[PDB]
Amino acid sequence: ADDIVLKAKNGDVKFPHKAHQKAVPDCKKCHEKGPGKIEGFGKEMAHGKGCKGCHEEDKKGPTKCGECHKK
Numbered sequence: 001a002d003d004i005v006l007k008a009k010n011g012d013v014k015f016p017h018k019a020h021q022k023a024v025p026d027c028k029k030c031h032e033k034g035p036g037k038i039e040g041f042g043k044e045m046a047h048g049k050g051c052k053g054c055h056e057e058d059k060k061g062p063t064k065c066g067e068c069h070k071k
């Protein structure tokens, strides 16, 4: 399957799956979550444990605005 882009108004956010599969071999960090996770995602989650928060805890991955968001 293809990578996906979240169409944030301030700039597209690419989600590169390959890098994540490699860097986060614990797949259950994202997969086999209970229902509601597709509906649940949004800005709050992205800037929290959904994207940015994990990068901050793991000490790797983009944590600056222009590193995630790119026109």
Ligand code: HEC
Binding pocket: 001, 002, 003, 004, 015, 016, 017, 020, 021, 022, 024, 025, 026, 027, 028, 029, 030, 031
């Ligand atoms: C969140 C950070 C994830 C982690 C960690 C893992 N996966 Fe993932 N996966 C995630 C998303 C958002 C998507 C769909 C969008 C995309 O970019 O592909 C997927 C997709 C898969 C797929 C289908 C991919 C394909 O057919 O090319 C598989 C088979 C899959 N995910 C498995 C998988 C495994 C085994 C992981 C751990 C090693 C893993 N993923 C990590 C989100 C995230």
Ligand code: HEC
Binding pocket: 013, 014, 015, 016, 019, 020, 023, 024, 029, 030, 046, 049, 050, 051, 052, 054, 055, 058, 060, 061, 062, 068
């Ligand atoms: C942990 C559970 C994570 C979640 C949830 C998300 N990301 Fe992530 N990401 C994570 C790590 C440990 C890394 C480092 C990977 C590396 O090899 O450098 C990353 C990396 C990225 C990258 C950069 C990939 C690259 O090739 O440099 C991007 C662009 C990225 N992550 C985006 C991103 C988004 C948009 C997420 C939510 C939708 C997201 N990540 C979740 C760990 C985790």
Ligand code: HEC
Binding pocket: 006, 007, 008, 009, 010, 013, 041, 042, 043, 044, 046, 047, 051, 052, 055, 062, 063, 064, 065, 066, 067, 068, 069
């Ligand atoms: C990746 C780790 C991100 C970092 C660092 C920052 N943002 Fe972000 N932002 C990210 C995603 C994946 C999303 C979309 C959420 C979704 O619904 O899919 C967003 C969203 C925003 C928004 C709202 C956009 C919209 O509703 O169309 C804004 C205004 C925004 N982000 C701004 C922003 C700024 C200023 C940041 C640095 C302080 C920043 N983001 C960091 C992913 C990531």
Ligand SMILES: C[C@H](CCC(=O)O)[C@H]1CC[C@H]2[C@@H]3CC[C@@H]4C[C@H](O)CC[C@]4(C)[C@H]3C[C@H](O)[C@]12C
Binding pocket: 004, 006, 015, 029, 030, 031, 033, 037, 038, 039, 040, 041, 042, 045, 049, 050, 051
């Ligand atoms: C559930 C995990 C981990 C974050 C968490 O624990 O909540 C998060 C991390 C990345 C999240 C995905 C980002 C891309 C998609 C955003 C959509 O608007 C909702 C579905 C997707 C596919 C999201 C579903 C789910 O919300 C995921 C896979």
